[PDB]
Amino acid sequence: SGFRKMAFPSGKVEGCMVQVTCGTTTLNGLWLDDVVYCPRHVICLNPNYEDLLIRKSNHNFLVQAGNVQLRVIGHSMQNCVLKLKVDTANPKTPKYKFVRIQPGQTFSVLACYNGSPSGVYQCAMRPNFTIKGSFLNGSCGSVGFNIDYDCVSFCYMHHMELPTGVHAGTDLEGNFYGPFVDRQTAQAAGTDTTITVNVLAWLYAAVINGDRWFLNRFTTTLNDFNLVAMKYNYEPLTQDHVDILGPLSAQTGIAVLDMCASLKELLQNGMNGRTILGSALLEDEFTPFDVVRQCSGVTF
Amino acid sequence: SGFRKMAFPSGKVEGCMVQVTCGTTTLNGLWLDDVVYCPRHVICTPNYEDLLIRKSNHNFLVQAGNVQLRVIGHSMQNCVLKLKVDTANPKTPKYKFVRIQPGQTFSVLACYNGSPSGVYQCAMRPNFTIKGSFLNGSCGSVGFNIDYDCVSFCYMHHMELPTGVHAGTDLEGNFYGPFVDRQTAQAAGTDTTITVNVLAWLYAAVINGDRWFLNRFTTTLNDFNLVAMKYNYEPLTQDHVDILGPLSAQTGIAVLDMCASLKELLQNGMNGRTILGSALLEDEFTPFDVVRQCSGVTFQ
Numbered sequence: 001s002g003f004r005k006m007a008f009p010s011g012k013v014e015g016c017m018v019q020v021t022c023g024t025t026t027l028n029g030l031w032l033d034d035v036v037y038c039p040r041h042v043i044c045l046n047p048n049y050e051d052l053l054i055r056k057s058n059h060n061f062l063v064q065a066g067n068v069q070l071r072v073i074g075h076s077m078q079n080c081v082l083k084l085k086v087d088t089a090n091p092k093t094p095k096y097k098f099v100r101i102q103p104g105q106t107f108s109v110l111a112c113y114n115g116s117p118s119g120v121y122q123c124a125m126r127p128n129f130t131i132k133g134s135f136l137n138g139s140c141g142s143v144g145f146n147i148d149y150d151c152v153s154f155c156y157m158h159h160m161e162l163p164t165g166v167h168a169g170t171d172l173e174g175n176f177y178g179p180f181v182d183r184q185t186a187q188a189a190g191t192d193t194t195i196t197v198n199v200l201a202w203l204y205a206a207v208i209n210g211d212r213w214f215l216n217r218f219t220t221t222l223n224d225f226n227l228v229a230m231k232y233n234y235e236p237l238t239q240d241h242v243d244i245l246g247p248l249s250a251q252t253g254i255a256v257l258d259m260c261a262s263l264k265e266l267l268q269n270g271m272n273g274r275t276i277l278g279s280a281l282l283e284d285e286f287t288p289f290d291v292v293r294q295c296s297g298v299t300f
Numbered sequence: 301s302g303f304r305k306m307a308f309p310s311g312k313v314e315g316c317m318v319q320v321t322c323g324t325t326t327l328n329g330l331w332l333d334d335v336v337y338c339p340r341h342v343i344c345t346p347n348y349e350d351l352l353i354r355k356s357n358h359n360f361l362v363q364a365g366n367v368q369l370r371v372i373g374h375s376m377q378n379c380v381l382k383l384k385v386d387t388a389n390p391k392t393p394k395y396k397f398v399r400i401q402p403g404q405t406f407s408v409l410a411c412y413n414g415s416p417s418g419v420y421q422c423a424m425r426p427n428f429t430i431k432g433s434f435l436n437g438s439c440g441s442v443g444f445n446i447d448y449d450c451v452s453f454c455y456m457h458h459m460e461l462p463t464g465v466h467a468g469t470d471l472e473g474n475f476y477g478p479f480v481d482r483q484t485a486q487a488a489g490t491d492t493t494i495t496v497n498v499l500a501w502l503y504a505a506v507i508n509g510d511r512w513f514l515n516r517f518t519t520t521l522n523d524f525n526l527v528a529m530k531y532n533y534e535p536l537t538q539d540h541v542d543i544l545g546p547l548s549a550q551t552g553i554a555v556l557d558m559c560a561s562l563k564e565l566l567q568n569g570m571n572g573r574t575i576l577g578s579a580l581l582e583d584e585f586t587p588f589d590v591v592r593q594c595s596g597v598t599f600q
């Protein structure tokens with residue numbers, strides 16, 4: 001038992017981190033097979049990336065893997081990411097995929113500086129397409145990932161910090177999550193919402209862990225609960241969310257719409273001093289999959 | 301900016317994790333040089349000396365992935381079994397075995413069948429238990445800290461107590477607290493909030509621009525400790541004040557000045573406000589955790 005903000009083990013990603021330098025700019029790169037991926041702003045107010053890239057040559061990119069220098073034999077741009085072909089395939093390349101995640105999904109971040117790891121943490125892609133990360137200057141090129149049975153699915157690459165302290169980035173194909181751009185223009189995160197299906201998943205995790213003070217004898221309907229969710233800035237609950245919660249409702253014997261009646265009471269009345277898994281706020285950064293994995297040992 | 305529950309990168313520890321089987325029990329072992337360390341209760345199903353004397357090297361099946369490591373010797377040190385193997389771990393990091401004090405945090409690499417599954421951060425509570433997240437089969441999973449390239453192993457998982465919290469040993473097999481590896485009725489004593497860690501996290505909040513809770517008054521250790529006792533917080537000592545010195549210098553806020561701000565939070569509550577997104581005071585970030593995360597300390 002117990003329930004924590006658990007990230008995936010980072011070792012498979014640590015073996016892929018390199019330092020990429022172009023002129024006075026230094027950031028991180030991800031080295032998979034014979035290619036190094038990094039934010040294209042490593043070569044750059046009003047940039048003409050295509051003209052900047054044609055002006056640069058292979059020798060203008062300094063790639064360092066620990067103490068070894070990688071010879072760059074090619075270079076191309078894919079959206080907001082720069083791909084540097086190197087003369088050696090990474091002997092530590094794990095099984096990997098590049099995936100674009102949807103809002104509400106969680107992933108681990110290996111924060112890096114100068115191609116070296118600082119730490120790992122778990123975060124979620126918010127409904128407004130930002131992440132509440134922990135990044136400082138030089139963390140660009142740090143990636144977010146999920147691990148499924150030895151295969152690393154890379155989903156995020158860090159590019160920037162927005163005015164409110166939240167972060168923006170791209171998938172490993174260079175496509176920004178949300179409306180953000182890699183230019184020094186005005187851009188801010190939109191209004192965010194709470195991920196309802198994750199709050200319910202975490203309520204089931206609390207029940208599995210013995211916290212049942214918030215349970216009640218009542219059951220609501222999807223339509224009635226969604227009216228409550230809109231008032232509290234919670235994402236609408238769909239029948240697909242109810243279905244995905246299936247293993248947790250089966251394990252605890254509590255229907256999803258029975259748990260929704262507990263959530264409605266918690267939204268309207270609070271906790272009156274009590275806590276749920278050590279928290280006085282409703283937590284929305286654990287998916288239903290994260291909960292079955294951590295609480296029941298699914299995939300372990 | 302941002303402040304997350306951040307674990308150390310786990311790559312150096314994943315390279316040491318192996319599967320240890322004795323009869324019908326499978327658990328995790330830590331492989332350093334030509335020795336595998338694991339909980340001695342792997343030999344059970346209770347006189348441990350007699351259970352070990354009856355065992356032979358062939359009764360221990362050790363696997364590093366799908367590769368078997370032949371056991372060529374065995375011995376018991378306190379509550380850990382040391383299995384000498386025919387292969388030295390070529391991924392053995394620079395390491396130390398350290399026994400930590402209550403309040404200290406560490407990263408746990410949760411493992412099942414010798415396979416790393418998750419990483420999270422937790423603390424040695426003042427009652428010598430850890431509020432971890434472990435399931436059946438997680439025994440032999442370790443807790444650690446890293447400094448430069450040296451891994452200090454501080455915890456090996458052995459058991460879960462009635463309240464869902466956990467108990468284990470250092471890597472020399474000595475239990476933290478008054479717990480034993482027997483099937484007896486053991487219980488965690490009353491816990492206390494780690495004051496020095498709460499102060500550290502308030503400095504983390506200040507570094508991140510959260511400063512509504514600051515006041516310009518100062519207090520004394522004696523006056524602060526009267527309030528601490530009332531709210532089940534550990535007394536603050538001159539050692540804790542000295543340990544907060546660097547964070548005090550970084551923010552320009554004296555330790556006793558921050559104590560007067562914590563005193564007001566304890567007596568008045570947060571009144572609907574949050575600090576680093578939390579409605580409760582967090583006590584599982586040490587002063588050093590704040591320095592590492594806010595300055596971007598990396599590991600080699």
Ligand SMILES: *C(=O)CCCCCCC
Nearest residue numbers: 160161162163164165301
């Ligand atoms: C990047 O520097 C993070 C802060 C952005 C603020 C922009 C001006 C309001």
Ligand SMILES: *C(=O)CCCCCCC
Nearest residue numbers: 459460461462463464485
């Ligand atoms: C180990 O078996 C964890 C559960 C212990 C509870 C004993 C009964 C209170």
